[PDB]
Amino acid sequence: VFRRFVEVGRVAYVSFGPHAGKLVAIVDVIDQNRALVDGPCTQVRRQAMPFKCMQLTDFILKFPHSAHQKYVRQAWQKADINTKWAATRWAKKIEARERKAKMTDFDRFKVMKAKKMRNRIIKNEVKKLQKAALLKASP
Amino acid sequence: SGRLWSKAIFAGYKRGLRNQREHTALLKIEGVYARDETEFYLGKRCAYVYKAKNNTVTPGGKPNKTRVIWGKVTRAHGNSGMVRAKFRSNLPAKAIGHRIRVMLYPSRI
Amino acid sequence: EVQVLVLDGRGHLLGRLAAIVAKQVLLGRKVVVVRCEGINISGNFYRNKLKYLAFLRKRMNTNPSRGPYHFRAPSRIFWRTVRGMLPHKTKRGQAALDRLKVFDGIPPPYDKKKRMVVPAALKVVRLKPTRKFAYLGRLAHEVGWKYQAVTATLEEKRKEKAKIHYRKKKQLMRLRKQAEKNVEKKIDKYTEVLKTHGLLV
Amino acid sequence: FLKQLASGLLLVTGPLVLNRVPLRRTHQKFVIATSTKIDISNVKIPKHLTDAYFKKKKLRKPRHQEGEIFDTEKEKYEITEQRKIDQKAVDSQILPKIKAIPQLQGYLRSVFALTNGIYPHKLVF
Amino acid sequence: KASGTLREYKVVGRCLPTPKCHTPPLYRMRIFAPNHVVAKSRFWYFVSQLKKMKKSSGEIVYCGQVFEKSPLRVKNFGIWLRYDSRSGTHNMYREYRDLTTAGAVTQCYRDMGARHRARAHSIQIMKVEEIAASKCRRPAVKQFHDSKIKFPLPHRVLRRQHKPRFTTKRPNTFF
RNA sequence: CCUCGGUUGGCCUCGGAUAGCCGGUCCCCCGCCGGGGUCCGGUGCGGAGUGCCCUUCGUCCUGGGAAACGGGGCGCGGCCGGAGAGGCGGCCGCCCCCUCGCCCGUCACGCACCGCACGUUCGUGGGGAACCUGGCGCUAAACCAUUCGUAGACGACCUGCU
RNA sequence: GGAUGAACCGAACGCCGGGUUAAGGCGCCCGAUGCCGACGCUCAUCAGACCCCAGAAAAGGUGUUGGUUGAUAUAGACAGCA
RNA sequence: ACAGCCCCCCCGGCAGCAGCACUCGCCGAAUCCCGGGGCCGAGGGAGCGAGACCCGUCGCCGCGCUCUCCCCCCUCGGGGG
Numbered sequence A: 001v002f003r004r005f006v007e008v009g010r011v012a013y014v015s016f017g018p019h020a021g022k023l024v025a026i027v028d029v030i031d032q033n034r035a036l037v038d039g040p041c042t043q044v045r046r047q048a049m050p051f052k053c054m055q056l057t058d059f060i061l062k063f064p065h066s067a068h069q070k071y072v073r074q075a076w077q078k079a080d081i082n083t084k085w086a087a088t089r090w091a092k093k094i095e096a097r098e099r100k101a102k103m104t105d106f107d108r109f110k111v112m113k114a115k116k117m118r119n120r121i122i123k124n125e126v127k128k129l130q131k132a133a134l135l136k137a138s139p
Numbered sequence B: 001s002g003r004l005w006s007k008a009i010f011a012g013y014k015r016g017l018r019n020q021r022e023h024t025a026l027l028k029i030e031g032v033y034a035r036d037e038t039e040f041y042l043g044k045r046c047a048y049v050y051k052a053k054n055n056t057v058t059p060g061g062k063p064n065k066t067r068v069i070w071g072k073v074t075r076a077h078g079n080s081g082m083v084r085a086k087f088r089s090n091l092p093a094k095a096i097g098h099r100i101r102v103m104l105y106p107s108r109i
Numbered sequence C: 001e002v003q004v005l006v007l008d009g010r011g012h013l014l015g016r017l018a019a020i021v022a023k024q025v026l027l028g029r030k031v032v033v034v035r036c037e038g039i040n041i042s043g044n045f046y047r048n049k050l051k052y053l054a055f056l057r058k059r060m061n062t063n064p065s066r067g068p069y070h071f072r073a074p075s076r077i078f079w080r081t082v083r084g085m086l087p088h089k090t091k092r093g094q095a096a097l098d099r100l101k102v103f104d105g106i107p108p109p110y111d112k113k114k115r116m117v118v119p120a121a122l123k124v125v126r127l128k129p130t131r132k133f134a135y136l137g138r139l140a141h142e143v144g145w146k147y148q149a150v151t152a153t154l155e156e157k158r159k160e161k162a163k164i165h166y167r168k169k170k171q172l173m174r175l176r177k178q179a180e181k182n183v184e185k186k187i188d189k190y191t192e193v194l195k196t197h198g199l200l201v
Numbered sequence D: 001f002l003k004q005l006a007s008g009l010l011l012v013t014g015p016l017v018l019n020r021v022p023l024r025r026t027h028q029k030f031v032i033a034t035s036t037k038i039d040i041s042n043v044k045i046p047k048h049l050t051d052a053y054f055k056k057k058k059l060r061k062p063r064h065q066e067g068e069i070f071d072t073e074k075e076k077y078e079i080t081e082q083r084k085i086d087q088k089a090v091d092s093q094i095l096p097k098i099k100a101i102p103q104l105q106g107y108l109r110s111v112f113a114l115t116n117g118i119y120p121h122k123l124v125f
Numbered sequence E: 001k002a003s004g005t006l007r008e009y010k011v012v013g014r015c016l017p018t019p020k021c022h023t024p025p026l027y028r029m030r031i032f033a034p035n036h037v038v039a040k041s042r043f044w045y046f047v048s049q050l051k052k053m054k055k056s057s058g059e060i061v062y063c064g065q066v067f068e069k070s071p072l073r074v075k076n077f078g079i080w081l082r083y084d085s086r087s088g089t090h091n092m093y094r095e096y097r098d099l100t101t102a103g104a105v106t107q108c109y110r111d112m113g114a115r116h117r118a119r120a121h122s123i124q125i126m127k128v129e130e131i132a133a134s135k136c137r138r139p140a141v142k143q144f145h146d147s148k149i150k151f152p153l154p155h156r157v158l159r160r161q162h163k164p165r166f167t168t169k170r171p172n173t174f175f
Numbered sequence F: 001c002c003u004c005g006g007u008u009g010g011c012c013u014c015g016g017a018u019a020g021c022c023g024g025u026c027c028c029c030c031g032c033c034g035g036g037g038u039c040c041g042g043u044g045c046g047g048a049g050u051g052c053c054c055u056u057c058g059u060c061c062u063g064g065g066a067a068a069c070g071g072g073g074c075g076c077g078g079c080c081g082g083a084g085a086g087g088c089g090g091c092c093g094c095c096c097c098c099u100c101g102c103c104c105g106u107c108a109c110g111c112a113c114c115g116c117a118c119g120u121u122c123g124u125g126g127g128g129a130a131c132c133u134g135g136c137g138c139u140a141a142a143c144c145a146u147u148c149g150u151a152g153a154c155g156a157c158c159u160g161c162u
Numbered sequence G: 001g002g003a004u005g006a007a008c009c010g011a012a013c014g015c016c017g018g019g020u021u022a023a024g025g026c027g028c029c030c031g032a033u034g035c036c037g038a039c040g041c042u043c044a045u046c047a048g049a050c051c052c053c054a055g056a057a058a059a060g061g062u063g064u065u066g067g068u069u070g071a072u073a074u075a076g077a078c079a080g081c082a
Numbered sequence H: 001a002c003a004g005c006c007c008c009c010c011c012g013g014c015a016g017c018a019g020c021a022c023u024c025g026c027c028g029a030a031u032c033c034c035g036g037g038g039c040c041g042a043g044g045g046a047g048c049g050a051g052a053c054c055c056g057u058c059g060c061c062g063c064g065c066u067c068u069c070c071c072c073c074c075u076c077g078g079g080g081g
């Protein structure tokens, strides 16, 4: 049933807290509630971190547990987690949320105009397809 | 042309459990549900707009039934985005659960 | 808000939803709770039935016709629960109580409308998965409610009609996706604006 | 926005051909500054455009103390030929910079409004 | 004694010199306290219990916080303590996993309060020691000694239950 | 006229599970549409309520795109669906309009009321008396009095009266 | 403030505006946690829920959670079957 | 070893330093600048001087310029060093 697991080398996304919006690697597990956590390439120094503010991703790095920053950083850079992360639908959904949030009034006006025209064209095509499908006569 | 004011609800007066300070009112602004989001609305003018029986003079217009009690947001209240408002006269108690307009007037943005 | 807030009672905990609804109607908001037979109560069914039977026992000894009115429908049970969180002996509380409507099943005004959900009152997130719970409809039926069967039949008809409507909506959305694929050279100019400003990933 | 005057009132003109706002004073407390800007450097705002230029003019009430005959004349404010010339002179060099950036003129033609879902504290201007 | 996130303090004290011993011995203790004022108070409590010293007849020559020498390493802590129950006094040995010794002692105080209703004034921490993973005795601590540890997060409860307060979609607990 | 004021865009709907879901598609079975078995996608829900839709300055020259199998009818007539409180919704036929409304441009104009509030909607709002204007329609009961006695303190009740 | 209350807890009082607290609180009544609060314990077919205070004991439980001491076990424990 | 971990080293080197990669403190003679919201405006003859005369732009405190002269940079005498 489960596909994403808490384990050494698993890359997690920080949902909230001081490090929200960042990627980290799980270096070790502490007492079912916390994990020794290290983002050497995403600017999260080694520290404890609760599992509540983690959202596991699909990337697993291969380093032994409680390895140093050097080995975590080499595991991160080789098979680059930054670009592979940015390529995912998750990361660009986050990016779309951010750029929708930072949109100004003129940008909202332009989006309103473009969306108006786009919706009208799509609706005309939908009506055309409906009438094309309404010409069915078969016993 | 457009609404141009934020909707708020007159939730009640500033009060203890068994004491009520009617000189200041509590407003629930729609869409503001955290204390840190209330900083925009501090100092903004707010109006309680209502209708009555007799006509009253309208600034820049003909007399009508509309009357206003003016006020402004003074500070935040609670952690959940309440605000406190001081009006020129204390709000009537029939206005509890009714519309208050936050007018964006003293803009700082 | 200014519209009527329609809340689906299925999967919701009684007191949690009632506290939310009471605060909403005290803030001057129209609230309509549908499908009150689907409301859950934490704790096992025998315990909750015992609580309601104690409530049944509480009656006025001199003249029970004046005493507490024990309402057996799930909608009326939820209504009385909300009244217990409202200040119903003042004019403000009575107006707040008037701003609330409760129904068993989903009546024709509201079966054709979208229904909201309160996560802070949902059983799935507010209750541990190993704990037991009771259904308000079953409790009401076994404590005196008479219309469990007819409400179930009407709910099943409503669900069949909703399935038909949902199939129509799915077919329309498939046709819309096909339309977007059909017109893309005349759409990409505005699609790029939307993508640039974060709408439409 | 063009310039702050000597009294701190802003002098603005959403060009009259766009949204019917002439060269007009306004208070910075009662405006919202958006992020969109047009480079109106090295345009020439005429020097006579001052607070005394934009101050309101009044007629009443000389040689008349008790009102028995209606004095509602002159209530029609008249636009001066000088004001029309100034508006033309400013707009003639404001408008080409507006048209230089796409669909800014439609933005200036439209008015601002609060849709039911949008909130000014989350809006970026 | 209340709590917070406790800190370790090295507290060194001694009796005041008298014309019986010009150089009284120096005594050192580890005190886990919210702050240095409480640390000094607990030092005087403990040395009054052990030696025949008082705050008035003695002085505190040093009170400094002890920083953890490896806060980036998960390690096992055994704690020997004693406490007063409602009906007697008992000695306990408890085990925890934490990065810091002070964090482990804070975990101990919370756990004693949770399981035995023991308030912090009843608890006397008498030894704290980092132990090897083979020396551990508590299975709840031992089960995390896996080089290939792996578990999911089965039933993730929605914590943002009020943003939004009202919504159309029901939450998902599977991730 | 009199009176009561609120409000200041809409969402027209699967069922649900939560140690799982959602979407799409080829073969089997039931009336050309659904149910299964594959297979392919998505899943910190993007076929997303942290969403979607509509979007209000108005016109006049004036070009390029969208459309042109198109929009409007408080225009008529017909049909269908909806009963849980249907108080609603959808589809056709005739007729009458404009080729305008949607996007990007060209062109100038409107009280530009000289900084200022209750502005902007629902709305042709609800309710009550009354006047005028036309069309199409209706001509009743209840109570008292009387009688009854299946009833009864009195009321009430059961009854009868070209 | 303790729902309520001569005595409890805070604090003592001219008529007011603003700020901040005490004791006590912050699901709703009812102002305030609508914190993505922390760690555990607990299921009650009479659960529990805050000084005074408004109800309980001895004695039990193979319910569950910790802890103390002791013992057996690959020279094969323990439990089952013979 | 075809990964790593802990301690002592014969000794370290560079950067940064209670970190602007939000791991963990106490502070400011070792501390300053800027901004926003709210409430308020009580008082009313402050002139040692001219012998006041238009309503004392006054006391304390902190400053600038001139009663010296050279230069420098922008305006067209004014402004800034």
Ligand SMILES: [Mg+2]
Pocket: none
């Ligand atoms: Mg009291």
Ligand SMILES: [Mg+2]
Pocket: none
């Ligand atoms: Mg009490």
Ligand SMILES: [Mg+2]
Pocket: none
């Ligand atoms: Mg005391």
Ligand SMILES: [Mg+2]
Pocket: none
């Ligand atoms: Mg006060």
Ligand SMILES: [Mg+2]
Pocket: none
């Ligand atoms: Mg209380």
Ligand SMILES: [Mg+2]
Pocket: none
């Ligand atoms: Mg409250």
Ligand SMILES: [Mg+2]
Pocket: none
């Ligand atoms: Mg520093």
Ligand SMILES: [Mg+2]
Pocket: H043
């Ligand atoms: Mg004064």
